[PDB]
Design a protein around this ligand. Structure first.
Ligand SMILES: NS(=O)(=O)c1cc(F)cc(F)c1
Ligand SMILES: OC[C@H]1O[C@@H](O)[C@H](O)[C@@H](O)[C@@H]1O
Ligand SMILES: OC[C@H]1O[C@@H](O)[C@H](O)[C@@H](O)[C@@H]1O
Ligand SMILES: OC[C@H]1O[C@H](O)[C@H](O)[C@@H](O)[C@@H]1O
Ligand SMILES: [Zn+2]
Length: 257
C-alpha cells in the first residue's frame, strides 16, 4: 500500500506506521558546521573482497542487489560499530531530475541519488532478529552526483531493462561492490531508522562525505524503471526518497578533524 505518490507517500506513512513520528527517524539533514569530530571513533573497515552477489530484484519501490549473508564474507566493522555487520543488500534512492533524489542532505543540499549498503549485526543471528534491536543494522550511505561515469556501476545499469517492473528479478552473480565506493572513507554518523516502512529505529547510519560521480546516462536508466507490475499502467520509478526528518535529541559525529 505504501509508496511515494501524493496519496500513499511519506506524509501518509504515519497512519499505518506511527513510528514515522518517532524520536530517531531517518534521513536527516547533516549540518556540517554543527557536526563534531569524535575521537572515540575507531578506524572504519569496509571488507568486501569476498562478497558473493546473487540476484537483482525490482520490489516496486527500488531495486535490490542481494548477497549471500549465510556466512561472514562482505562485512563492515570499526568506526562507531561494536562487532561485525554482514552485507545483505544494496539499493538506491533517486530523483526525476538531477537536482533531487538523495534522502540525507548536506547543509540542505540534495544530491541526484543515494546508495544504501545494508548490513546486520551478527550477534543477533538473522536480519529479522536484528530489526528487533537498537543496534541491529548499519547502513553505509553514499551520495551520487552527475558528472563522469562510474565504471563499477555500469553492470547494474545494463541489467535494469530485464527487471523493468515490480516483481521481476534476474541473476546477478559475480558483482564487486568495491567498485561503488569513493576514494575517501571520511564519514558522518548518527543513530536512526529505516527510511521506508516499517521505519524501524534499528540503524547506525554511516554517511560518506565524498560523493561518487555517475554519468547522466547512468542515472537516466534508473529513471526508466517502473513502480507498477507487468501489464499495468506505466508509473516511472522516480522520486523514491523520503525527505529529511527532525533531528530531535541527536548529535551527528564526524570521523575527520
Ligand atoms: N532505505 S533503508 O536502507 O533504510 C532500508 C533498508 C532495509 F533493509 C529495509 C528497509 F525497509 C529500508
Ligand atoms: O566477482 C566479484 C568479486 O567476487 C568476490 O567473491 C571475489 O573474491 C572478488 O575477487 C571478485 O572481484
Ligand atoms: O558535556 C560535554 C559533552 O557534551 C556532549 O553533548 C558532546 O557530545 C560531547 O562531545 C561533550 O564532551
Ligand atoms: O556481475 C553482475 C552481472 O554482470 C553482467 O550482467 C554479467 O553479464 C553477469 O554474468 C553478471 O551476473
Ligand atoms: Zn535506502
Amino acid at each position: 500500500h505504501w509508496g511515494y505518490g501524493k496519496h500513499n507517500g511519506p506524509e501518509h506513512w504515519h497512519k499505518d506506521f506511527p513510528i514515522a513520528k518517532g524520536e530517531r527517524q531517518s534521513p536527516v539533514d547533516i549540518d556540517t558546521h554543527t557536526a563534531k569530530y569524535d575521537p572515540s571513533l575507531k578506524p572504519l573497515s569496509v571488507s568486501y573482497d569476498q562478497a558473493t552477489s546473487l540476484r537483482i530484484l525490482n520490489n516496486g519501490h527500488a531495486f535490490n542487489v542481494e548477497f549471500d549473508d549465510s556466512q561472514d564474507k562482505a562485512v563492515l566493522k570499526g568506526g562507531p560499530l561494536d562487532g561485525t555487520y554482514r552485507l545483505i543488500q544494496f539499493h538506491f534512492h533517486w530523483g526525476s531530475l538531477d537536482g533531487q533524489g538523495s534522502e540525507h542532505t548536506v547543509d540542505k543540499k540534495k544530491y541526484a541519488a543515494e546508495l544504501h549498503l545494508v548490513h546486520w549485526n551478527t550477534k543477533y543471528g538473522d536480519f529479522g532478529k536484528a530489526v528487533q534491536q537498537p543496534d541491529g543494522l548499519a547502513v553505509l550511505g553514499i551520495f551520487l552526483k552527475v558528472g563522469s561515469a562510474k565504471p563499477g556501476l555500469q553492470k547494474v545499469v545494463d541489467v535494469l531493462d530485464s527487471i523493468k517492473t515490480k516483481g521481476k528479478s534476474a541473476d546477478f552473480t559475480n558483482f564487486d561492490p568495491r567498485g561503488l565506493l569513493p576514494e575517501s572513507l571520511d564519514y558522518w554518523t548518527y543513530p536512526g531508522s529505516l527510511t521506508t516502512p516499517p521505519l524501524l529505529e534499528c540503524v547506525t547510519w554511516i554517511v560518506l562525505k565524498e560523493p561518487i560521480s555517475v554519468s547522466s546516462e547512468q542515472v537516466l536508466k534508473f529513471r526508466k524503471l517502473n513502480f507498477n507490475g507487468e501489464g499495468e499502467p506505466e508509473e516511472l520509478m522516480v522520486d523514491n526518497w523520503r525527505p529529511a526528518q527532525p533531528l530531535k535529541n541527536r548529535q551527528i559525529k564526524a570521523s575527520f578533524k
